[PDB]
Amino acid sequence: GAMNECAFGTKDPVYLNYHDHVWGQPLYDSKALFKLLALESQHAGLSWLTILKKKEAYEEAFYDFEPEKVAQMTAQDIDRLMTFPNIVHHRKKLEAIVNQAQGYLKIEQAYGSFSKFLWSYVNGKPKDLQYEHASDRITVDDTATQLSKDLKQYGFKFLGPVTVFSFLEAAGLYDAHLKDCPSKPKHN
Numbered sequence: 001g002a003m004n005e006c007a008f009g010t011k012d013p014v015y016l017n018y019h020d021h022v023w024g025q026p027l028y029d030s031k032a033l034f035k036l037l038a039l040e041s042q043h044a045g046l047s048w049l050t051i052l053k054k055k056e057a058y059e060e061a062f063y064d065f066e067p068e069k070v071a072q073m074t075a076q077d078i079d080r081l082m083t084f085p086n087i088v089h090h091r092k093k094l095e096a097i098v099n100q101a102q103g104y105l106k107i108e109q110a111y112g113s114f115s116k117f118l119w120s121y122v123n124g125k126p127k128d129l130q131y132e133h134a135s136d137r138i139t140v141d142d143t144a145t146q147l148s149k150d151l152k153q154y155g156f157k158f159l160g161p162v163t164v165f166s167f168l169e170a171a172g173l174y175d176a177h178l179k180d181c182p183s184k185p186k187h188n
């Protein structure tokens with residue numbers, strides 16, 4: 001039915017729990033948003049479920065994505081992570097998270113809150129994309145393109161427009177659930 005169409009055809013409870021409890025569900029906590037963003041940056045070349053299943057390994061490797069701690073990681077820390085089990089052993093991908101954490105800190109210095117910075121891109125409330133079929137879905141748009149360009153100036157890496165669009169859907173700044181999906185959030 002609708003949930004199958006909405007949730008990328010999966011019957012995996014890990015992915016379904018993610019669909020129901022995280023994906024497209026508005027998230028306002030700054031450190032939690034950073035986490036989703038950093039995980040999205042690890043996707044390219046792999047399946048998304050692959051990254052999802054590596055989440056706990058990443059949390060251990062990156063101090064539960066606490067940006068103050070991640071931003072201080074050294075080349076020697078990355079050397080160590082290249083053989084840490086069950087994260088993606090892609091050196092630029094791992095280095096990118098450290099750079100992202102530095103950029104988060106710069107944003108917070110200028111704007112107070114990474115969450116307030118991000119939510120501004122949708123005027124403070126979730127944009128319902130109003131999809132009816134999975135075939136309606138696009139992979140990038142103007143807002144994601146702008147946010148991608150803007151993050152670069154603060155030192156974020158591995159976050160192109162398509163990747164940022166995926167993050168907006170995941171964080172619930174965009175609601176990409178189908179109209180009849182039982183997990184579609186209510187809006188006001």
Ligand SMILES: Cn1cnc(N)c2ncnc1-2
Pocket residue numbers: 008023040043048166167170
């Ligand atoms: C298919 N899919 C579902 N959820 C996400 N967060 C994703 N990121 C990249 N691709 C994704």
Ligand SMILES: [Zn+2]
Pocket residue numbers: 003006007019177178181182183184
């Ligand atoms: Zn859904």
